Each structure stands twice: as structure tokens, then as C-alpha cells.
Paper text:
Single-stranded RNA bacteriophages (ssRNA phages) are positive-sense RNA viruses that have shown specificity for gram-negative bacteria by exploiting host retractile pili, including T4P6. Acinetobacters have type IV pili (T4P), which are involved in twitching motility, surface adhesion, biofilm formation, and natural transformation in gram-negative bacteria. Our study delves into the interaction between Acinetobacter phage AP205 and type IV pili. Using cryo-electron microscopy, we solve structures of the AP205 virion with an asymmetric dimer of maturation proteins, the native Acinetobacter type IV pili bearing a distinct post-translational pilin cleavage, and the pili-bound AP205 showing its maturation proteins adapted to pilin modifications, allowing each phage to bind to one or two pili.
Residue numbers in the entry:
A (entry chain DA), B (entry chain GK), C (entry chain GX), D (entry chain GY), E (entry chain GL): 1 to 129
The structure:
RNA sequence: CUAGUACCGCGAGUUAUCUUGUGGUAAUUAAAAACUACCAGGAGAUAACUUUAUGAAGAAAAGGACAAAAGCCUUGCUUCC
């Protein structure tokens, strides 16, 4: 039951969503479409840039029930860019799906968030046996 | 019990742990292997430096309960460097054990931390009778 | 038991012990008291340096050995420094055994003295669960 | 009873005592030994400077005590210098004995502490009748 | 049952092992991967430098092992370099296997180790009849 | 008192972090009086680099004599620093 956003800046190359209850949080997606001559063939390349921004209150040190004592907000941001030829969209979606698993198995379930990299983490590619 | 730290940076020359609860707490172990020349014999020397760091906020003058403002924190650092030939590790451990007791006599049980030195403390060497 | 040392050089800040039978073995403790001031608080910082020195003969020809080979000697040293304010000394002692515990589980039980590092070793915090 | 101090800095001339509970409380003694000649005979004069320092917090309460209003300390210093040849040390102790009573009359029992001189106060000499 | 080693230092392109009992013994594996351009047949090349180092004491005089006399150890080194395209690795393994056969002919079975070269020994090709 | 005895010092620079806090930049103030935002900056603690004490090591490419070279030298790079 997440709060849905509404578009704010609608443009042929950029749309920004923001939450009515919390105007601070945003999610903006921008596309840059380009035509590429990779070799003896002309191809249409697209680079979609998706960024989600959230301003959250700081840790709120313990034993501080007082309401109007207010801390500043840090910067929780996530940026993603997807670059690939349009005709290879079907196989590109496989890349996006497996990219999520690699990040999740390394950061979500792993400890990459705290700042530690696990060389023995098991990550796999899109290609299957 | 105690919350176990988890490594944040790992390297064959140094490893740094940190408390996931608070990142200020730190315990870093570093090594410096060295090949040391003695009389017609070559011996492998290892010098391991171990540092434990804690940020403790103020002494918090008692009487009144703490108002919710952060106290500037001081550094409580314990640094330990152990140097010796690798092959004499068996006897160096005994030297480490008696070293712990000697410091405990001066500091854990004495008033060394307050800045006082007792020239009558009982100090026992690694060699036994 | 172990042979006690007697004080050698009683200085304003440094006292050095030494075994009467073996003058090579020493245990010197030096104190440095500093006047440090933090936010609206006056602190007495104490940095205690403790050095344990032992000169150990070489591994001694393996296989066997007589009682007249007398190999050269090599330096075994252990230095620890304890830095912090005396105002919160009682809690400063808390990480001392924790620092003792962390090094023991990493160097005594482990093989860090040889030159190895164990990124998966159990390192526990001073604070309690 | 009274909490004893421990020596801090030891020197051939000066030794400083400080209280473990209150590091600021201080009793320092410094001696300057010198040879002087008056009746074509050398005399070994000893000058002993004794200083006692305490930091009494000024009378903070004004009806209101409160948990943690902390207002600064004041200087309470007592310095005594004892001079005279060690040859007449036996009678010089009696001089110290008399000096104590004379000061006690003016200050300990009288109102010299308030800042008043009593001309008719009873003052007696070391020499007895 | 040969003694197993564990890695000493890790690097992006270098791993070394050493025996805990004897730190002198080492085994270094270093890789160098580089992009090789060919006649419009792109290839990936690797260069593996494998070094085995042993410090062995010089041979004691014949007919006497009793006397625990230590000769200064000498350096024994075996270094191997493998270069080739990763695509042709499968047949390159046969190259390595054949290389062993030729060396064993001169070195192990033969006496090329003593400094004597035999232009008669059978040297077989990698490919089969 | 002064051959000695004995006594004294332990530190460089740059950068960042924390604490203290000298001035300046403007505000309320007739005001750089004093609180505030920034900088410079005296001081104490910590971290990184050149280099100090005193620095030391790790070859793998190049040139130097030479066959374009390696082995004899240094430099690229790194380590506590």
C-alpha cells in the first residue's frame, strides 16, 4: 500500500514524480536516444537514467521523546542508467534482471552497505547452461 | 555477550573491523613482515600492530539527567605492537602473557591510568623459577 | 612463580624494572599527563606507554643440541600505549580486556604471529549485548 | 580519615603530591640547599618551600541549588618557606612550633581571614620564660 | 604428505604461499593479462610467472650428521612462464604437458643438472603421430 | 659553581578530521564592543603525502658500456612514513 507519486515536470525527455504527502522525495527518469553506426549497420541506442531521491531524518539519538527537537536530513539517492540497442531490448531485460540479483546478493543480503566487499560472494551472469 | 564487529576493509597487510551499531568503534590489525639478519643465520621477523579505538562522549557531569544534545567525544585508543621472530612464536606467547599481567598490575589494578606510578609494584618476568 | 624485577631508573615519569639475574629483560612504564579541554569540559588526558623487552637466543639448531652451541640472540619487544582521560577511567578499562581478548583471539589462538591474517576471525566489542 | 596523595614527579629537589580522586588537589615541596659562611665557619643552609593548592568551587548556591549549575573554582593556595642552617635545626623546629601558634591566633581563631588586623591579639615568642 | 601452505599476500595479479613451519619456502603465482590485436582476430593473452623458492642448507661433510653444524643455506629457484591466448588454452595445456616431458628427459633422467648437455636425448613434439 | 660531573631538547612542511579559540569579512547595535555564517589563524589530539630525524625495502619496463637489452647503476609504481 505504498503512496503513489504524481508527475511534476513532464517533458519528452524527462518526467519527475513527487509524493503529495512528502514533496521532498522524488523519482525522475530521463532518456537519451541516439542512433549508432556500430559497423556496416545503423542501430538505435537508448540510455535511460532513473534516479530516486529520499531525504530522511538522521539517527535520532536515543532517549529523546521531545518532538520539536529536529535533526537535518541526509541524502538517500539511487541512480541507475541502462544503455543498450533498442533491437536487443528482449535480451537487455535479461541483463537488467540478473543485474538486480548480483547487486542484491552482494549488497541487500550482503554487507556492501556498511562498506565491506566479499570476494567469495557467489554472483552469476545472464547466460545459462 | 558482546556484539561482534564485522570487517569493513580487508587486506593481507591490514584488516579493520567496525561495530555495525556504531562505526566509530574500530579495531585494526596490521602486520609488517621483515627478513632480519643475525649471526650466520637468517630469521623471519614479524611486527604486528593492533589498534583499538573508541569515541567516548564526555564524562557527562552527573546530577542532572542528560538533555538531548550530543557531547563532543574524546578518543580512547589502545595501541599494541608485537615484534619478534616468527620461529620463536612459542616462547613469545609466554612473553605476551606475562606482559599482560605486568600492565594489569600497573593499570588494571593500580593507578597508572590516573597518572600515578607505584615503584613498589610486583613485576614478574617471562622466565619462571 | 616468576623472578621479580627491581626498579632501575626512577624518573619523574618513567620507571624501569630489570631482572637481577638477567639484566637484558626489562619492563619500562612511562606516563605522559596532558591538559586537554573539550566542549565546556576540562579533562586530564593520560597516555601510558608500557614496553616489555626480552633478548631471546636463536631457535637453536634443531634436531638436537648440546649445551655449548650458544646461538646469537634476537630482540623480542612488546609495546602498548593507553591513551584517554582519567575522568572516565573505569569505562576505559573495559576495552582493555576487550583489546586483550581481540588480540588473543587473533594472535594467541590464531597464527597472526607467523604472518597470516584471518579476515573471518571473531572480534567482539567492548560494550555488552 | 583523609585520602592520601601519591607522588607525581620525583626529583632530587622537588616532589609533587596529587590526590587520586581529585587530580587538581596538590601538595608540592621543593628544597634549595646552600652553604653560607658568617663566622668564618661554613653553614649548610636549607630553604624548604611547601605549597598546598586546592580548587574550591565558589559558593554556587544562592538559595537555588539545582542539579547541575556548575560555576568555576577558586584558588586556595598556602605557601610556606622554611629557612635556616641545619646546625641549629633543633631550635628551628621550635621556631616552626611558635610560628604555627602565632598564625593560629590571627587567622585560625581571629578574623585575619576576613581581612582584619587585631593589634591587641596575643603574640608570643619562641623563647620561653 | 606434503606440507600445505596458505597465502601470505594477495594482490590484483599476484598470490604467494608460504609454509607456516618454514617461512623461507614460497610459491608465487603472478598473472599478466593483456589485449592482443592480430589480423582482425582479437585475442586475449595471459603471462603466468610461477616461482618456487626454497632455501636449503649446503650439504654437510660426508659421514657425519651427528654434529649439529649448520651450513649457510643456499637459494634454490624454479621459475616458469606460460604465455598464450586464452582461446587456444585447451591445446596450450598439451604444450605444458609436452614441456614437462622434454625437461624430465634432460633434467630428471639425464644429468643436465650437473652441467652436462646431451645432444642425443630424445625430445618429442607436442603433436602426436 | 664552571674539562668532567651534570644539565637541556626531541622536533619539518602540506592537507583533512576533532576540541579550544586571535583577527578579519556583515548583520541587531552610534559598533570589527557581544551573540551569529565564512575564512585566515595561535594552541592540543588524530589521519594521509614529500621528506625530517635516519629513512629502508620490494625489479618489471626503459636508458647508460653494449648485440635494441637483462645481468653493474638509476628511474615508473608501492609499502610504516
Amino acid at each position: 500500500a505504498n503512496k503513489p507519486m504524481q508527475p511534476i515536470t513532464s517533458t519528452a525527455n524527462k518526467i519527475v514524480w513527487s509524493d503529495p504527502t512528502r514533496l521532498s522525495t522524488t523519482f525522475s527518469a530521463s532518456l537519451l536516444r541516439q542512433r549508432v553506426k556500430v559497423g556496416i549497420a545503423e542501430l538505435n541506442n537508448v540510455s535511460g537514467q532513473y534516479v530516486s531521491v529520499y531525504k530522511r531524518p538522521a539517527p535520532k539519538p536515543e532517549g529523546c521523546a521531545d518532538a520539536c527537537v529536529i535533526m537535518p536530513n541526509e541524502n538517500q539517492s539511487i541512480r541507475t542508467v541502462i544503455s543498450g540497442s533498442a533491437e536487443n531490448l528482449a535480451t537487455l531485460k535479461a541483463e537488467w534482471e540478473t543485474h538486480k540479483r548480483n547487486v542484491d546478493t552482494l549488497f541487500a543480503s550482503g554487507n556492501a552497505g556498511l562498506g565491506f566487499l566479499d570476494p567469495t560472494a557467489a554472483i552469476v551472469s545472464s547466460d545459462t547452461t
